[PDB]
Symmetry: C2
Subunit: 436 residues, 2 copies
């Protein structure tokens, strides 16, 4: 019944309430890694052309799944503020559910023919097109169901119940792995039905315990169609932030593409080791959005700032240990990917450089999440994109023309995540000041 943080809550009591929100969210994202990694093992069982049709379609789903951030943010942030304000959050759910159902319609029928038409700028023949169509025919069949499940995740996370979406995720992963492995060995369509069936089951779940059980709230009868204007206004900066950043990664990765085909491999190898250390900060970002959102809606700003200050220092300590393990044991972490010793050379240089900025990378997530919970979704859009260019790409684009070294993009990457962190603890200090 709403997790408020009192302004003098002991440090120990605050953190033990952050991990109760973060750990279930982290498990959902850790299972997402296993769900996709096992999916790669199931598609690489027949022809290698099915591996190419999947990896290029999954990355094409990354740019496409940015529309989910529109309905997620509007649902997750407004529910958190309402629950904190001791208010009925019933209209926000089925307005976001209705909102997610609408934005998914342009991807219905029309979105299906957008990837096949796009598969003519890489050399994709009629065979790669036909195979990639089998995999995406059931996926694009049931997109509104995937958009409705994503709104239930935001509704659960906003209300403070992140355990139950983890339970459904544990069922969703086994269902996807179970359905795919069974139907794959009958065409690559089986892996596509695993996504479709794991989404209908999660939705059939997310529909059953609404009508029959708890859910974030006991539903009711919505009477407020004017709230989706604020859900669209809230979700718009978050949807653009995730989309523009993914476009900015390809530009930054392009800086390392000029260094042969070994630095690109070493960058991806460190990226996987970075991703394991990234599931934490993203989970603590969503947990901070819930905590800051409910305390903001409760008008308990004294404790809202105390909760985010406590979780900022603690996660910085956790990432400090994470940064220490990365710097101390670089070669140990690359052994599963240790093919060429020269690749290990750049991989060890990468992890040691980015390991310095792991604590700073925690302040960005804890403050972005806090600011998103306060309804300031435009701030992470402005902060994460401005700094990404005039502090990463722009300094690297000029210094690479003189000082040719692949650790120039990696050095400016660590330097910028530390400047972005010092940017957040300033806006937040400013927003809190006017808040008091």
């Amino acid at each position: 019944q709403r997790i408020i943080v009192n302004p003098n809550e002991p440090y120990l009591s605050v953190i033990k309430k952050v991990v109760k929100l973060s750990i279930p969210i982290i498990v959902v994202n850790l299972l997402y890694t296993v769900e996709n990694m096992i999916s790669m093992i199931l598609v690489s069982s027949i022809s290698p052309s099915a591996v190419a049709a999947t990896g290029f379609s999954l990355s094409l789903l990354w740019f496409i799944y940015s529309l989910m951030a529109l309905s997620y943010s509007g649902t997750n942030i407004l529910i958190a503020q309402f629950v904190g304000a001791k208010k009925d959050p019933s209209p926000i759910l089925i307005n976001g559910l209705f909102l997610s159902f609408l934005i998914s319609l342009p991807l219905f029928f029309y979105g299906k023919d957008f990837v096949l038409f796009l598969m003519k700028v890489l050399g994709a023949s009629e065979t790669v097109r036909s195979l990639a169509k089998e995999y995406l025919t059931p996926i694009f069949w049931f997109i509104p169901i995937g958009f409705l499940t994503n709104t239930f995740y935001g509704a659960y996370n906003g209300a403070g119940d992140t355990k139950t979406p983890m339970k459904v995720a544990i069922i969703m992963n086994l269902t996807h792995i179970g359905t795919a492995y069974t139907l794959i060995n009958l065409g690559v369509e089986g892996a596509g039905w695993g996504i479709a069936i794991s989404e209908i089951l999660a939705f059939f779940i997310y529909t059953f315990l609404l009508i029959f059980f708890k859910k974030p709230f006991p539903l009711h009868l919505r009477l407020e169609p004017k709230l989706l204007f604020k859900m669209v206004r809230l979700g718009t900066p978050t949807a653009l932030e995730r989309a523009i950043t993914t476009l900015s990664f390809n530009v930054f990765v392009g800086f390392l593409a000029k260094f042969g085909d070994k630095v690109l491999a070493a960058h991806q190898i460190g990226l996987r080791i970075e991703s394991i250390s990234f599931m934490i900060g993203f989970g603590v970002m969503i947990a901070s959005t819930t905590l800051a959102g409910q305390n903001y809606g409760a008008r308990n700003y004294r404790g809202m700032v105390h909760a985010v200050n406590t979780s900022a220092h603690f996660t910085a300590l956790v990432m400090s240990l994470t940064g220490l393990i990365l710097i101390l044991f670089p070669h140990y972490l690359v052994y599963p990917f240790s093919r060429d010793p020269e690749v290990i050379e750049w991989a060890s240089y990468y992890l040691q450089i980015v390991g310095i900025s792991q604590p700073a990378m925690a302040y960005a997530s804890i403050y972005s999440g806090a600011l998103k919970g306060m309804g300031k979704t435009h701030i992470p859009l402005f902060v994460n994109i401005s700094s990404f260019w005039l502090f990463r790409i722009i300094p690297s684009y000029f210094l690479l023309k003189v000082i040719h070294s692949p650790l120039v993009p990696w050095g400016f990457m660590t330097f910028e995540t530390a400047v972005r962190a010092l940017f957040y603890y300033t806006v937040f200090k400013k927003v809190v000041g006017k808040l008091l």
Copy 2:
């Protein structure tokens, strides 16, 4: 620039044409400048016309980022002028913000010829011709964003005459520079399609200098003032973010609507472009009254004079709708006369006539959309035109046309669902605006 709530009808619409007509002249000159630019490029080869016309349609998509700096500058200056506050921090921040967003386009923005151009069916020479045409254009994109922000600063302050004077200078410079370089007038070498690009680039560097010269030596729309306040960057970005997404998604949304008419041969697609240009000349009117409404509603909203703000937009709505009643009637009564400059196949005249006879009925409602989309922009609700002009588009234009065309094949189905959608969209606005006005009082 302040309308009293009991002000006579004439006294408010006089101030409307004072703002709208200079913007209309700006918009009409750009439409006439585009026609003249095609003729200079058509003097080379039809391959150069394809490389130019394809790059321009991409520039329509690319130049959506200008809405980020324009909305932040145009809207906040209008409110600051109404609120009797110094608008200098908004101009210096808009110029700085427009210069920042233009940087990613300055580097990798040019490299879309070997991507978006080459993929969508560009010949072996159309790609190479579009390269040297966009090389000078993308050399001074930051200057293009700086000029555009000055247009928002002028329109926000209520001085739309001076940007018209610069636009008249900008068009003759562009046409003069292109005509001189396309064929080497003064014994100069013929630069080809590159000259068409230098006309755009040189016209921007001159329009920027004229604006800059007026800023320093004539204490301009407002004297630029020392103390900066980089803080409103967030407010300007938050205000410009929905508008930039609106124009960008609309272009991708508009291409979905043309696909419906692509399944009816090349004569319906030709009559659609014919009916578009004829109606687009009537589009530049509503765009000027929209920008004028953003200024008028924006300034009166900043002065806290709400009852007068509602009286000005209602009067502007009921006047533009009368103009679009005359404009719409000319489309109904004289179709073949407007299509005659483009009338080639007698069946193309037949399809273009049914288009103008359908969209001409939705011209008054089209005026209510612009006058209300602009009124809400000036109030700061830039998210409302985003949700209205997109949700109404799919729910009442694309999807109804998608279903009815699967059972009845006729070009009058998406055209009829057009007019029907741009009338249940104007009614979408007047409701929101009436609800937002009530809570504002």
